[PDB]
Copies of this chain bind each other. A is one copy, B any other.
């Protein structure tokens, strides 16, 4: 199964409405970046993901370093990823990294990155 995983930071303050917007931001940025790419593998995974109902896994981490660690993992393995920063319209200061999107891609491939995280 092909899946998309979004890693959300738990150490910053975000209401459920805020969290939903950030996760949606991560997902849209990933999809658009893939469509605008010339990476055939990524496009194949995206098409399958859509056919499978857009399965998503929303997990969390309690530090910025844990997000950077996983983004580097995704990058090294040539997987699609998106680092989302706040637009600073509310509490949070603009530029604050809120979450990381990865995929869509084979879930076992993605698990070699986020298989140890707790669900949000």
Given contacts A16-B19, A20-B19, A50-B32, contact A25 B56 (CB under 8 A): yes
A43 to chain B, nearest CB (A): 12
CA distance A5 to B26 in the complex (A): 16
Contacts of A31 in B (CB 8 A): 28, 31-32
How many residues of A are in contact with the other chain, CB < 8 A? 26
Contacts of A2 in B (CB 8 A): none
Contacts of A8 in B (CB 8 A): 20
> By the criterion CB–CB under 8 Å, are A58 and B21 in contact?
yes
A91 to chain B, nearest CB (A): 14
CA distance A87 to B55 in the complex (A): 9
A6 within 8 A of B: yes
Interface members, chain A 55-71 (any B CB < 8 Å): 55-56, 58
> By the criterion CB–CB under 8 Å, are A54 and B28 in contact?
yes
A17 within 8 A of B: yes
Report the 4 A-B pairs with minimum CB-CB distance, sorted nearest first: A17-B120, A20-B23, A24-B27, A17-B58
